[PDB]
Amino acid sequence: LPDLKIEKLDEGVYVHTSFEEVNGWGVVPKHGLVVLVNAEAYLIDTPFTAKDTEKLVTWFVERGYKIKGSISSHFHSDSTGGIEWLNSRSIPTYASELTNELLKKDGKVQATNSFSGVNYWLVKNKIEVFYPGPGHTPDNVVVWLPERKILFGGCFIKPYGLGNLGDANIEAWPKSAKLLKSKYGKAKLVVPGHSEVGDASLLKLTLEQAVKGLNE
Ligand SMILES: [Zn+2]
Ligand SMILES: [Zn+2]
């Protein structure tokens, strides 16, 4: 029910926030990014719905920023819900091979472009994809913007509680978070999927929460 939000975070970097009512959770916000590269837009995660995906795309297109592509950080609908709509508009969609395998298992439309293995450049030296290992989901990836030092952690970054454990790997999450913290300690900003933007301390807080959740 709250409207899509689009807010500038940094030069060429915007945070989009969409909202869903989730049974037992109440209203759940979902953050992704729009990243501008030579005045074209890349969507980092789609909103939950085709409606908010269209609103997001239109906001940029009507301002002269063509959509070059989207990438989805994991198979959950809060990262993937707009894939069908983007595909229908011939906008390239990206997801890991494993994310696409889990979408297909969940009866969902797949991204048209897949990648495997651990580091992938969506845009050489500008938008990097990294797989830290299983945590929130088996397939969760993070997106790094090296020129800005901004990490989109997505639903893997859980600084105050692990959220929905439905598809989580509570055994692997601590090792995965330790690796992410080691690689991205230099981050200026970490953008979580469900919590507000913070600094690199969110990598430590996620590790602390994963360690705490394995204990039970
Ligand atoms: Zn999720
Ligand atoms: Zn999520």
Residue numbers in the entry: 4 to 219
What does the paper say about this structure?
IMP-type metallo-β-lactamases confer resistance to carbapenems and a broad spectrum of β-lactam antibiotics. IMP-6 and IMP-1 differ by only a point mutation: Ser262 in IMP-1 and Gly262 in IMP-6. The overall structures of IMP-6 and IMP-1 are similar.
Here, we report the crystal structures of IMP-6 and IMP-1 with the same space group and similar cell constants at resolutions of 1.70 and 1.94 Å, respectively. The kcat/Km values of IMP-1 for imipenem and meropenem are nearly identical; however, for IMP-6, the kcat/Km for meropenem is 7-fold that for imipenem. However, the loop region (residues 60–66), which participates in substrate binding, is more flexible in IMP-6 than in IMP-1. This difference in flexibility determines the substrate specificity of IMP-type metallo-β-lactamases for imipenem and meropenem. The amino acid at position 262 alters the mobility of His263; this affects the flexibility of the loop via a hydrogen bond with Pro68, which plays the role of a hinge in IMP-type metallo-β-lactamases. The substitution of Pro68 with a glycine elicited an increase in the Km of IMP-6 for imipenem, whereas the affinity for meropenem remained unchanged.
